[PDB]
Write a protein that binds this DNA or RNA. Structure first.
Ligand code: MG
Ligand code: MG
Ligand code: MG
Ligand code: MG
Ligand code: MG
Ligand code: MG
Ligand code: MG
Ligand code: MG
Ligand code: MG
Ligand code: MG
Ligand code: MG
Ligand code: MG
Ligand code: MG
Ligand code: MG
Ligand code: MG
Ligand code: MG
Ligand code: MG
Ligand code: MG
Ligand code: MG
Lengths: 93, 46, 260
RNA sequence: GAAACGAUGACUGAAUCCGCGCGGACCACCGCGCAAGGCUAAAUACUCCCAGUGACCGAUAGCGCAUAGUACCGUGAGGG
RNA sequence: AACGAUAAAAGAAGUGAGAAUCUUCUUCGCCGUAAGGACAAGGGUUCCUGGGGAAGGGUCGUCCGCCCAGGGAAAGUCGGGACCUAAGGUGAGGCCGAACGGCGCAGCCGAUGGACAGCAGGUCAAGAUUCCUGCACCGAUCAUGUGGAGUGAUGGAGGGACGCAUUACGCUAUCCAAUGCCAAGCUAUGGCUAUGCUGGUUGGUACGCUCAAGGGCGAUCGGGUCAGAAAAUCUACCGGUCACAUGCCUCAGACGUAUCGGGAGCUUCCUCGGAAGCGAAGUUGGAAACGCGACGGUGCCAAGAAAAGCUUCUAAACGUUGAAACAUGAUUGCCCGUACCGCAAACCGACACAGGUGUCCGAGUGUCAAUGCACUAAGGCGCGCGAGAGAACCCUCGUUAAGGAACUUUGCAAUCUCACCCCGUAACUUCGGAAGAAGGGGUCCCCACGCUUCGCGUGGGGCGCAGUGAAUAGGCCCAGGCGACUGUUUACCAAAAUCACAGCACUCUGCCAACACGAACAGUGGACGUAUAGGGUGUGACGCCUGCCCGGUGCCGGAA
């Protein structure tokens, strides 16, 4: 459904500083399309989406043991809206 | 000195691959023999 | 004639007229079947294509035609004659010695014994000289397509005509087979001196390799210290000189006085 | 081998109950049996696995491993 | 013993527990057809930020490609998939096979190739034909309106569509010159006071009657049915007509105007370092591609993919009052790859290895030319042990008295020789060659005259021991043996007198050919070849020639 299929919002210097261009971003579920993501994000925050991009991220640290690593494997989607802006109250982070 | 090993992804996948062991039973023989080998790792995860 | 060359390490060539380049199948080079190499060598080449060419020439019967151009194509070693028919259909045929450009060629059983015309042996005049002969009605012409070759007619039997194949072999070929008047022109290939090593390569790969160079493992003639050999035999110890490699067969009674 | 009999690969190809196969060339007696249709637990074999015990080991032993077919070697099969 | 190339380093300044090695400044030497830059394969966070100091780093270490944590990678158009096909793989049916299995038409898979819609800038510490700004373009679904009627298939046709070498013309990238234009400033050393010095000198989009080499195109009526299975207005034909040079079609690229960028620098602020604001001129002359115009021109023999998209034509079907086509907004753009290394410290080599790795770009000066040679630009780097000593010996170089091969298996090695111009050049010869034979001479600078372009010749003059002033740079000849020749070969002791080689000969083979692979009356290779062909064998350009003996052996023929 709508509320999963997008996991968690990205947090960084160049992340929420770009939250101010009306551009938001979050890690979504790796098997997803731009369309399903559009539907989801729009049906979540009630704003139409023009700008969309998405990408695919690796993994692989380790610390201890012979354990030597694992890939965690995220995906980060980035959205621009039309002049309708400011998602929820949570664009105010 | 050009070495014996000249890595090619699509090659190591064409020969040796799981899908490659599919086509014949010498390779499926290899599969089951490897499964019981201990828990080894059969070719294309490596 | 032929082309010649001043002294730069050279001899001969051939002389090719009538330029077109028209409409036919591709082909690929290879020397062997599912396994290893069967027919030895000839793995080279200039990457020729293939011109599907009519041999049998049946369905054009009763319909006349004009020679368009004469093009010189590999996989042939003959002049290819282009034909246009009254049908509107274009077709390729071989080009006999002394066929001008734009003569009239007609097929069928009624046709007149003139150059290029297709017509069965039963109609072929006594002692006449023709090429492109079928062994069997239909299929195609397996006889006299080569460099400067022809076959004449030695008599009649019942359905059969006595023909002279160009080894100088007498044979019985039934009169139900189409034939083409004249000898395949081909200039004369025996003339062309094939230049130097690699003029081979031009058409096909590295030629004869003497087993006497080889080693006991490789060929019979192999081994020894010097240049020599004893017992005279090929890949397998059959031997080349005067051993009939033929078998006892059907067409063997359709053959009369084969000698040479 | 004196080689019977079962068994088929190729040619052949009988009888049917005063009948047929056998009994180690073959014959006659004399016995024993009745082919060319099928199914049929049990007593037998084995140990991935669970339990119990041992004039079995106890860290260079005991399974390769007090867990790892991991690290590590090889293109690979494979080894370890 | 070694610390992995003899491309040297030096001082100051910083930081720190500690510095030859980390940071900064200023110099120095090195690459610069690379030792710079961009990609592919492959590697897999090695990238960036802030840390860290065990091990790894051939010393050190505050440092790193190592350790920790966080961040960073954006696509309707680029490359791939939702398109097509080559070799190959596959393969219902089908042809074989003790099994497992070997085959195989269509079809299908399969880029290395075909097809296919954007460019210009900006910038995070780290992405960019992806994000943002400016202006594009493609297909799709639909809405107003035009039109106001046919669309026009797994099928036909056209077209995709292809070689090598050489070459006329026009242009661009791009580089060069200048008492062009613009900007900044001071320059002293003896002078110059600008006529010096340094730097900068147009990219995209748009219209435009401007300029333009080059480039490719005949048009319609109709005829035969026998041709494209059928169909046809499409195509192939035989014919009639108008088209010979003018003619049509497009314009690479230049020019103008516009406009959006960029641009030497410039100003301000500075958290000690980058942010932010601004903005000049854009000339004349020359050179010039392997790129573009183009699918150009001519010649040559060995005669140079397929298939879709695409263009036209019907079959069928629905509609012929609401078609195809157009622009006019809107809506729409799915999947995967994009970081970094990528001639190497990150790929393959156990190694931070003198090795290996395919494509692209690769500046200037001097030099006949040049990707050569020397020096340099942009860019990158001095090779992760140092410092002294100046013995034998050892390696790599430099010069050498008198002699000049006396050395030695052998002139092995190392000299000499060297470029370009002129003159000149033998036996022998297959009349091509031998030949760069052999020799001899010129070479720099200034001035006048001339000339067919950079320049060149003539004359005169000047300087040095010397003027391809440094680097790149053949010693030569006389006889032979072997092979004719280019070529090929023993990955790691043999490159040859070996193999191959054109040419020549013997013989086999009538075509489901002999011959070869094969569980097989499968299939395939010979060959989509056919007896101036295809196999096997041995000789080895070319020239003169190839003798005697078949008893024995093989081979063909015969018949008591
Ligand atoms: Mg880590
Ligand atoms: Mg030998
Ligand atoms: Mg032998
Ligand atoms: Mg021998
Ligand atoms: Mg070192
Ligand atoms: Mg140095
Ligand atoms: Mg230098
Ligand atoms: Mg250390
Ligand atoms: Mg200037
Ligand atoms: Mg190093
Ligand atoms: Mg240069
Ligand atoms: Mg001396
Ligand atoms: Mg001297
Ligand atoms: Mg001596
Ligand atoms: Mg001596
Ligand atoms: Mg020497
Ligand atoms: Mg030689
Ligand atoms: Mg050697
Ligand atoms: Mg003789």
């Amino acid at each position: 459904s709508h509320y999963d299929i997008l996991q968690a919002p990205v947090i960084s210097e160049k992340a929420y500083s770009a939250m101010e261009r009306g551009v938001y971003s979050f890690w979504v579920s790796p098997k997803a399309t731009k369309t399903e993501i559009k539907d989801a994000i729009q049906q979540a925050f009630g704003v139409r989406v023009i700008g969309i991009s998405t990408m695919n991220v690796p993994g692989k640290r380790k610390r201890v043991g012979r354990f030597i690593g694992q890939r965690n494997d995220r995906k980060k989607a980035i959205v621009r809206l039309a002049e309708g802006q400011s998602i929820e109250a949570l664009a105010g982070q | 000195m050009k070495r014996t090993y000249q890595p090619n992804n699509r090659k190591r996948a064409k020969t040796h691959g799981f899908r490659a062991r599919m086509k014949t039973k010498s390779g499926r023989n290899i599969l089951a023999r490897r499964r019981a080998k201990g828990r080894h790792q059969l070719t294309v995860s490596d | 004639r032929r082309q010649m060359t001043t002294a730069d390490f050279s001899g001969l060539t051939k002389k090719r007229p009538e330029k077109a380049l028209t409409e036919a199948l591709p082909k690929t080079g290879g020397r062997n079947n599912r396994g290893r190499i069967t027919s030895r060598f000839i793995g080279g080449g200039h990457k020729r294509l293939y011109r599907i060419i009519d041999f049998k020439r049946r369905d054009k019967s009763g319909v006349n035609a004009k020679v368009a151009a004469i093009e010189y194509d590999p996989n042939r070693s003959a002049r290819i004659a282009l034909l246009h028919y009254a049908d509107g259909e274009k077709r390729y045929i071989l080009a006999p010695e002394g066929l001008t450009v734009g003569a009239t060629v007609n097929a069928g059983p009624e046709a007149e014994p003139k150059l290029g015309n297709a017509l069965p042996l039963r109609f072929v005049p006594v002692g006449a000289v023709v090429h492109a002969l079928e062994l069997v009605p239909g299929k195609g012409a397996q006889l006299a397509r080569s460099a400067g070759t022809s076959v004449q007619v030695q008599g009649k039997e019942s359905d059969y005509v006595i023909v002279r194949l160009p080894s100088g072999e007498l044979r019985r070929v039934h009169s139900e087979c189409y034939a083409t008047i004249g000898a395949v022109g081909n200039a004369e290939h025996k003339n062309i001196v094939l230049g130097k090593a690699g003029r081979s390569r031009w058409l096909g790969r590295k030629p004869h390799q003497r087993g006497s160079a080889m080693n006991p493992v490789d060929h019979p003639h192999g081994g020894g210290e010097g240049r020599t050999g004893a017992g005279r035999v090929p890949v397998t110890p059959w031997g080349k000189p005067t051993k009939g490699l033929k078998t006892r067969r059907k067409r063997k009674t359709s053959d009369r006085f084969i000698v040479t």
